[PDB]
Amino acid sequence: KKQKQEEFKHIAVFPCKMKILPQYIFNSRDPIVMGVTVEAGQVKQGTPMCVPSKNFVDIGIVTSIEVNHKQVDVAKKGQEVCVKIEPIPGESPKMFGRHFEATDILVSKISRQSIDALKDWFRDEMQKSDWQLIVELKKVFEII
Amino acid sequence: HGSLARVGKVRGQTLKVAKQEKKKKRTGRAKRRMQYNRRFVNVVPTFGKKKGPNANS
Amino acid sequence: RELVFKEDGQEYAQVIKMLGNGRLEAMCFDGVKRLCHIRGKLRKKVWINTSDIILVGLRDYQDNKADVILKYNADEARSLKAYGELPEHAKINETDTFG
RNA sequence: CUUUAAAUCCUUUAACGAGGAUCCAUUGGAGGGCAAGUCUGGUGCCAGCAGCCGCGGUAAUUCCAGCUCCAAUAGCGUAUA
RNA sequence: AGCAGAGUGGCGCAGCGGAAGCGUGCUGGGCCCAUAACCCAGAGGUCGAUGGAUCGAAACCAUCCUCUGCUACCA
């Protein structure tokens, strides 16, 4: 079971719904660090995100989460965290003020193989509210 | 129609008609006697071409 | 001509790649991919383009390769959309014949 | 009764033992090769048949069933050297 | 948190005074058995906006807006 966890950690992601706080912005670019509050979902380290309202733009993945000087890998609903977003290699980096603002909503860049791997194996670790969020992201991301 | 990957549609939709009771067929030596009689004994001379033993046209 | 409905063992599909050798791949309504192998009565008389609603049967022993049954025109496709047999996620993206 | 170390079986021999003599013969096949229905109903390039040509497209002499018929007969079909 | 580069037809570009074009794309017709070539045409422009030195500004000057690339500074 833990061998399958270490095998399937990098290709299976968790649903996520991040709302960025105004004025709690702690970097500009590379890494893109700010303090965000978990509106919904559970965040996993290494999960990529994409903004739906700005024509499906990807900013990066998670490298470290700091919750009041604590290294907390997975955060639950309603906990204020600080994430350290590092952009993907090869693509151009993103900075504040022109691609994203302080009023957008961040959600995890989920993929069809990741819903398939969550339903095939991770069903015992899946909650109904996060499954509803997964259905919502399937309705949002043009995922048929 | 239902589906295409279903198997035995023709066998599962065949109008099942049971066999009817018939008299038993002679076997062993008497069948050769009846075949010899019906093929060489009570035949009429015929012109043209000879019809088969099942030509029900 | 007539409004054919589905049955237990068949579903609808949308073409992703129009491929050769008499085969293609189309999604289901939930996104599972079934390798569509075209029916023998639909090889030359009708022509299947890309991103159109079709009728594709399923298999009761495996999930690796499916078969196409029928095709629908654009007006009956948006009429079937107006009834609501599919969720509010799929968009036809204006496919029809030219003039 | 006989056989046989002792039996069993064969043969001999009692008393019983058939008229739809139910004490009921299967295995393959019926387009050509290759002997034998352009018979009747069902599916409609689907299900399937077919060693080879090929047969199936809502009138199938080849699929699935009933009747008839052909082959060898207590035997017949199939896969391999 | 501040800068650099660019804004012309759907896309991109040539580009400076007596002047809205090209390459590609769209529509109709002919030609052909039909299509692609070929021919005949047509549609599509606030030269990103504002004001000035200007008889003539898309052009020169100042501001703003939009898009793309930049310095390291963090719970």
Query: What range does the domain containing A79 cover?
Result: 16-141
DSSP state string for B3-57: -SS-S-HHHHSS---PPPP-PPPP-TTHHHHHHHHHHHTSPPP--S----TT---
Structure tokens at A23: 């004025």
DSSP state string for A52-115: TTTTSEEEEEEEEEESSS-B-SSB-TT-EEEEEEEPPSSSPP--BTTTB-TT-EEEE---HHHH
| Short-list A87, A111, A104, A91, CA closest to A11 | A111
Residue A5 falls within a domain, yes or no? Answer: no
Instruction: Report yes or no: A5 and A73 within 8 Å, Cβ to Cβ.
Output: no
Resolution reached, in Å? 3.7
CATH of the domain at A98: 2.40.30.10
CB neighbours of residue A29 within 10 Å? 15
Domain residue spans of chain C: 1-99
Which residue type does A94 have? K
Cα-Cα-Cα-Cα torsion B19, B20, B23, B27, nearest 10 degrees, comes to -10
* A71-CA/D63-C1' distance, Å: 71
Residue A8 falls within a domain, yes or no? Answer: no
Token pair 């957008």: residue: A104
Residue A91 falls within a domain, yes or no? Answer: yes
Q: Please give the protein residue whose CA is closest to the C1' of the nucleotide D41.
A: B15
Residue of C nearest to A112 (CA): C31
Residue A1 falls within a domain, yes or no? Answer: no
A75 burial level (CB within 10 Å; 0-12, 13-18, 19+): buried
Residue A7 falls within a domain, yes or no? Answer: no
Number of domains in chain A: 1
By three-state DSSP, how is residue A27 classified?
Answer: coil
Which chain B positions have a beta carbon within 8 Å of C9's beta carbon? 2-6
The backbone torsions φ and ψ at residue C24, rounded to the nearest 5 degrees and listed phi first, read -155, 180
Q: How many helices (DSSP H) and strands (DSSP E) are in chain C?
A: 1, 5
Q: Which of A112, A115, A144 sits opposite C89 (nearest CB)?
A: A144
Structure tokens at A121: 């194996």
Residue A4 falls within a domain, yes or no? Answer: no
Cis-peptide into A89, omega within 30 deg = no
Structure tokens at B28: 């062993």
Cα(C72)–Cα(A22) distance, integer angstroms: 51
Cα(A47)–Cα(A86) distance, integer angstroms: 11
Residue A122 falls within a domain, yes or no? Answer: yes
By three-state DSSP, how is residue C14 classified?
Answer: strand
Q: Which other chains touch chain B, taking contact as 3+ CB pairs less than 8 Å apart? A: C
Helix (H) or strand (E) holding C27: strand C23-27
For A93, residues 6+ apart whose C-beta sits below 8 A from its C-beta are: A29, A30, A87
Residue A46 falls within a domain, yes or no? Answer: yes
